[PDB]
Symmetry: C3
């Protein structure tokens, strides 16, 4: 087991690590749309969706793996009315990374997220 840490994902400010490498599998903590360079969250959902995805990417890359190694993700959103926009950003993100296939996924609307963000994404990648 190895702790994953990267300055390209929001700093772990609390009792948790950004992600963990189990050897054959990598698990990331749920990533909120905080910009790692400023500590701020963009106002619009499209930008938040892309920021969370970029954060997931940073944690996965810290293990030496790539976006294409992601096999499952869970997407928690604050409002499914924005699902069209989130899916568009989400699909485009994987397309832009030239992945062989999209990962398996679960998506649900929650009552609230940390810092009142509109989305949180956790992922599983395999080596």
């Amino acid at each position: 087991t190895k702790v994953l840490h990267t300055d390209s994902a929001p700093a772990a400010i609390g009792p948790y690590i950004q992600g963990v490498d189990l050897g054959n599998m990598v698990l990331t903590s749920g990533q909120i749309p905080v910009n790692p360079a400023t500590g701020e969250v963009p106002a619009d959902i499209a930008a938040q969706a892309r920021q969370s995805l970029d954060n997931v990417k940073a944690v996965v890359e810290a293990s030496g793996l790539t976006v294409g190694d992601i096999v499952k993700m869970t997407v928690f959103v604050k409002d499914l009315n924005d699902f069209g926009t989130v899916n568009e950003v989400y699909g485009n993100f994987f397309d832009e990374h030239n992945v062989a296939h999209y990962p398996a996924r679960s998506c649900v609307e929650v009552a609230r997220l940390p810092k009142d963000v509109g989305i949180e994404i956790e992922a599983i990648a395999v080596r």
Copy 2:
């Protein structure tokens, strides 16, 4: 890793795959109560719980595994007040498949689900 696909589960009409086979473990995407042949969702929760479970079963079976190979399920519901009905159907489904033991499970009521369905279920199975 291998992509899982079956006509017995709702077609992936978004940026995701039905499930993934990691060799030792199989992970399904969250399955909603859509009838794969008609694209329709039954009106009552008992029927929806049944359809989602059948969908999960289809994805797991696509890997060559069975319902008895499921080790963990996460059940997201729209209403814990229907938990009596959901719990009945859930237990019945596993009993009908003559499993040695029920899987580990987490159940929570979410704020909303894709397509305004009443339940979404994701599963982990092992070979």
Copy 3:
């Protein structure tokens, strides 16, 4: 695979097991803050958080592993306004167990939890 059972975690009263041991990984069912000795749930969120964590620990210990082997946990809460208290208890718990590092984590506010509890936690541990 092996079924995990312990009298130190709430009794599985339904179609599920407390946890499962897959050999290299242990998965616990979501643990609610029920005190296994009395069957009661404490009123305050701090007590509930510690009770759920102790229940998770009990399931993990039933496999032969320890708190230090926990690598990922998902924390579902009924109210994020109680998150300062939950993080406090959560960090204190791992600190008291002298873990080398905190595990990866995802935290979201749900609409409702079984028995109307304020927190539910599920964990993954590795051997």
